C-alpha cells in the first residue's frame, strides 16, 4: 500500500568531551536501511538492509559526505540555539531533525516532512504545503524568517517532490521481497491465573512487519477496550515486531473472550481464543 522514507538525525553536544555526537539513520517504512554515527572509527554511512547494498560507491560517498556535513552544520546550529536561548556552554543540548516523504499506493508523493526539535521540543517544521513553516516558539520564529528569506522551503520541496519519492520508489522496488511483503503476526493466547478466581488472557502477536497492528479483546463480541492492557509495539530485533494485549477475566468466563488481530499481512482479521 502506502510507504514512507525517513531520515532521522540527532546531534548531542558534549561540552568537555569533544564535538557533538551525531547519529543519523534512514528508514523505509519500518525498516532501518542506513546509519551513520560520528563516533565510528572513520565514519561512513553503512547499509542496514540487504536491498541497499547494491547501491554503488558514488551513492555511499555522497551519503557519507552529506552525513559528515550535517554533523558539522548541526554543531553550528547548536551554537546558534545556545545563543538564542542564552544557555551555558556547560550543558548538553540536543538537536533533532527528521525529514522524508510518504507515497501513496501509486508511488506519488502524499506528504513531505522536514522538521526539527531542540532539546526534545518542536522547534520548526515544514508545513504540509511544503512552502511554509510552523515555528514553535519565539526563537524558532526568528529562524523561520531567515529560512523564508533564503528560500529553504522551496529547496526542500524540490527534494521532497522529486528525489525523495524517486529514491523511495527505487528502494521499494529493489527491496520489494521484504519491504512489500507484509509478514503477518504469529498469534496465540496464553492464560495466566492470578488467583483461583481470575486469570489473565494475553493475546500475542509476534514476528509481524510492518509495525502497525491492532489487537483487541472482546467479551461476547463486545470490545473490552477500557479493561485491556496493551503493551507498546516492540521490536523483536530481527526486523519484525511484537505486541500483546491482555485482559483479566473471571475464572470460568475465559471462553467468552476473543482476541481480534488486524494487520496488513493478514488477508482477513483474525479472531482467536484461549485453546487450553
Amino acid at each position: 500500500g502506502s510507504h514512507s522514507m525517513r531520515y532521522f538525525h540527532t546531534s548531542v553536544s558534549r561540552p568537555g568531551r569533544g564535538e557533538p555526537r551525531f547519529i543519523t539513520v534512514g528508514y523505509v517504512d519500518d525498516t532501518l536501511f542506513v546509519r551513520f554515527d560520528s563516533d565510528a572509527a572513520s565514519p561512513r554511512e553503512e547499509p542496514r538492509a540487504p536491498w541497499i547494498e547494491q547501491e554503488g560507491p558514488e551513492y555511499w560517498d555522497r551519503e557519507t559526505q552529506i552525513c559528515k556535513a550535517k554533523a558539522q552544520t548541526d554543531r553550528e546550529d547548536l551554537r546558534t540555539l545556545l545563543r538564542y536561548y542564552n544557555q551555558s556552554e556547560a550543558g548538553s543540548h540536543t538537536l533533532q531533525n527528521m525529514y522524508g516523504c510518504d507515497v501513496g499506493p501509486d508511488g506519488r508523493l502524499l506528504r513531505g516532512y522536514h522538521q526539527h526539535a531542540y532539546d526534545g521540543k518542536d522547534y520548526i517544521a515544514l508545513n504540509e504545503d511544503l512552502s511554509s513553516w510552523t515555528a514553535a516558539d519565539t526563537a524558532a520564529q526568528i529562524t523561520q524568517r531567515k529560512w523564508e528569506a533564503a528560500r529553504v522551503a522551496e529547496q526542500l520541496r524540490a527534494y521532497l517532490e522529486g528525489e525523495c519519492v524517486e529514491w523511495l520508489r527505487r528502494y521499494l522496488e529493489n527491496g520489494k521481497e521484504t519491504l512489500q511483503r507484509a509478514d503477518p503476526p504469529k498469534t496465540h493466547v496464553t492464560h495466566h491465573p492470578i488467583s483461583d478466581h481470575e486469570a489473565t488472557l494475553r493475546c500475542w502477536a509476534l514476528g509481524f512487519y510492518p509495525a502497525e497492528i491492532t489487537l483487541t479483546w472482546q467479551r461476547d463480541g463486545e470490545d473490552q477496550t477500557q479493561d485491556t492492557e496493551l503493551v507498546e509495539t516492540r521490536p523483536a530485533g530481527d526486523r519484525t515486531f511484537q505486541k500483546w494485549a491482555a485482559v483479566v477475566v473471571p475464572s470460568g468466563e475465559e471462553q467468552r473472550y476473543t482476541c481480534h488481530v488486524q494487520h496488513e499481512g493478514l488477508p482477513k482479521p483474525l479472531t482467536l481464543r484461549w485453546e487450553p
Binding site: 531520515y7 534512514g26 547501491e55 551513492y59 555522497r62 551519503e63 552529506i66 552525513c67 556535513a69 552544520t73 553550528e76 546550529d77 546558534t80 540555539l81 538564542y84 525529514y99 526568528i142 529562524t143 531567515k146 529560512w147 533564503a150 529553504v152 529547496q155 526542500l156 527534494y159 528525489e163 525523495c164 529514491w167
Partner: peptide, 10 residues
Amino acid sequence: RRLLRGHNQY
C-alpha cells in the same frame, strides 16, 4: 537517498 543542500543558519 539524502537531501543534498547548503546550510542555512538558524
